[PDB]
Design a protein around this ligand. Structure first.
Ligand code: AG7
Length: 180
């Protein structure tokens, strides 16, 4: 109950359908006008968000003290909307999970929840040939169209879906300091 329920609350207040020139993605709204996307979505100066065109004030590929690719892009949106601040639900350190749910919301895959099970430490990932770090893995057959999906455990927001090989899926881990 509490876990699936947490995922459903997040969907409504913080998860949005977007489209870039690279296709359809799920977006996590983090706080106020700040959101996060998979880097592969390559957001431009304008993005579609639930059937409206929105100006992008800033977009930054995420960097930290390790100086590694993390497969995420932070964006600040030129919008009236202010996301409820969910940073307190993001752990300070990358966190695995026993019973995670992947929350997907795109125009093609609207408002869906997928129990992916265990989310385990994985680390380095060559993602279609691009070196990527700080990933976690689930033994679930994730699909094209699910990138940006939000990986949650009860009371915690732990990852963003970025890739998979047909049998397993991979997320970029989330840490609170990314959003400081
Ligand atoms: C084009 C449509 O794009 C999307 O739908 C975005 C979401 C999908 C979801 C995948 C889609 C499939 N099962 C999934 O879960 N992600 C990708 O396709 C990514 C590539 C893979 O997942 C690669 N997997 C690995 O490398 C990989 C490595 C190991 C280990 O496991 N997977 C491809 C071989 C599938 C897209 C990408 C390409 C170049 C990059 F710089 C970085 C990312």
């Amino acid at each position: 109950g509490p876990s699936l329920d947490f995922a459903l609350s997040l969907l409504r207040r913080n998860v949005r359908q977007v489209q870039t020139d690279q296709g359809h993605f799920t977006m996590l709204g983090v706080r106020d006008r700040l959101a996060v996307l998979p880097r592969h979505s390559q957001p431009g100066k304008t993005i579609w968000i639930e059937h409206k065109l929105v100006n992008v004030l800033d977009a930054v590929e995420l960097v930290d003290e390790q100086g590694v690719n993390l497969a995420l892009t932070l964006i600040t949106l030129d919008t009236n909307e202010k996301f409820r601040d969910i940073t307190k639900f993001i752990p300070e350190n990358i966190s695995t999970a026993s019973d995670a749910t992947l929350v997907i919301n795109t125009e093609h895959m609207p408002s869906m929840f997928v129990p992916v099970g265990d989310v385990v430490q994985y680390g380095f990932l060559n993602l279609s040939g691009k070196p990527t770090h700080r990933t976690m893995m689930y033994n679930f057959p994730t699909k094209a169209g699910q990138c940006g999906g939000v990986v949650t455990s009860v009371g915690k927001i732990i990852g963003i879906h970025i890739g998979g090989n047909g049998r397993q899926g991979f997320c970029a881990g989330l840490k609170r300091s990314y959003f400081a």
